[PDB]
């Protein structure tokens, strides 16, 4: 199954303990999604020494993030980083409402109809699986 964005259970710390999909997290595919501007765009802000070209320095290096943070905290950061870091510049990847002039990707066009999350449940679990190896 999949847990829809509006149906996610988030605790008081912004932690999400249950996965968004029960399909297994592919650590190999999560690595890929992080370099794509069209998906995660994680590199634009974050260093991952493991990936091995021009990572950003807005966000902290993600080396060893699995060693400092619970999986539930890592997923939570990806569902809605603002729950975990208030007023953070990190986009909210599993939010579908509460935006201001959202557009369809980088097309400058207004979204008409429902908002799809920046990443799917499967894409988030792929990326979570991959971050969990950074110990």
């Amino acid at each position: 199954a999949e847990v829809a964005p509006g149906d996610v259970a988030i605790d008081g710390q912004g932690h999400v303990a249950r996965p968004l999909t029960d399909a297994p997290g592919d650590p190999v595919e999560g690595r890929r999604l992080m370099t794509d501007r069209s998906v995660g765009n994680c590199i634009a802000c974050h260093e991952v020494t493991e990936m091995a070209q021009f990572p950003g320095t807005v966000g902290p290096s993600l080396d060893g993030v699995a060693a400092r943070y619970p999986e539930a905290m890592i997923r939570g950061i990806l569902v809605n980083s603002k729950n975990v870091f208030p007023e953070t510049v990190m986009p909210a990847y599993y939010r579908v409402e509460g935006f201001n002039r959202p557009g369809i990707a980088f097309t400058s066009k207004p979204i008409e109809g429902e908002i799809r999350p920046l990443m799917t449940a499967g894409q988030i679990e792929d990326v979570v699986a991959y971050l969990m190896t950074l110990t």
Partner: protein, 261 residues
């Protein structure tokens, strides 16, 4: 690097670092040109007009200035004189409140109102090559002059509107101009070195697209790249943001046309 002097053609001293304007002193120690955030190779392209590709377009606009256009049979020069004199200082003080309009005007809106109402000529596309090259000419004859846009009086409510927009998060990525340019200036987004997002160097010649880029063009692309809907070029929103962003660099020299990534 960031602290090396910018002198253009051996003659024009550019103030690239200045005391933060009082309205902004909260946030920065110091305001800086986007030039101070560029590589040495890119920085060098602005040090000589012969090495500055934007100046090719400024040279072509010099001809346009003197060429009669529209049904009235008149050229810019027929009312404004030599461009070096008639446009001197003007890039430094716009956007500004204009009496005949009872509104803050940009340089483009002034250029278009001359074309349509004084020249009998067709409007230029706000961010098209014709407008951007003329605006670059205008800027270039006031290089080394301090940007000094009024933020008070009949300009104030427009300035406040632009201020609101600067700190408003847009798009599905949910970012304001300050998100990146105030909080994270001097950091990297990928290979790009975050500047303070100043407009004193505009129109910019960008190595990315090998052309001149209008202020509202940049602004459009900035909101777009939050995964957002940009305001229209020439809109009251972008006019207001331009006055406000301009005010963020009061004291920096005029640099247009500048060379950037």
């Amino acid at each position: 690097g960031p602290d090396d002097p910018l002198v253009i053609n051996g003659e024009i001293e550019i103030v690239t670092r200045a005391p933060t304007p009082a309205h902004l002193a909260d946030r920065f120690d110091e305001i800086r040109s986007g030039w101070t955030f560029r590589t040495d190779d890119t920085q060098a392209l602005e040090m000589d007009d012969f090495e500055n590709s934007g100046m090719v377009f400024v040279e072509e606009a010099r001809a346009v200035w003197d060429r009669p256009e529209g049904t009235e049979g008149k050229a810019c020069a027929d009312c404004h004189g030599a461009v070096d004199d008639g446009m001197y200082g003007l890039r430094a003080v716009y956007p500004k409140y204009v009496e005949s309009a009872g509104k803050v005007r940009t340089v483009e809106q002034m250029i278009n109102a001359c074309r349509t109402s004084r020249m009998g000529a067709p409007e230029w596309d706000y961010i098209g090559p014709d407008m951007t090259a003329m605006v670059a000419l205008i800027a270039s004859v006031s290089r080394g002059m301090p940007v000094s846009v009024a933020i008070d009086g009949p300009a104030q409510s427009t300035w406040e509107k632009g201020r609101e927009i600067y700190y408003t998060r847009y798009g599905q990525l949910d970012l304001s101009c300050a998100s990146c340019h105030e909080q994270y200036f001097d950091h990297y987004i990928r290979a790009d070195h975050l500047s303070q997002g100043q407009i004193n160097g505009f129109p910019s010649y960008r190595l990315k697209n090998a052309r001149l880029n209008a202020v509202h063009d940049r602004f459009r692309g900035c909101i777009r790249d939050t995964r957002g809907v940009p305001f229209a070029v020439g809109s009251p929103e972008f006019v207001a943001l331009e006055l406000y962003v301009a005010s963020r660099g009061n004291g920096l020299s005029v640099e247009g046309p500048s060379v950037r990534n």
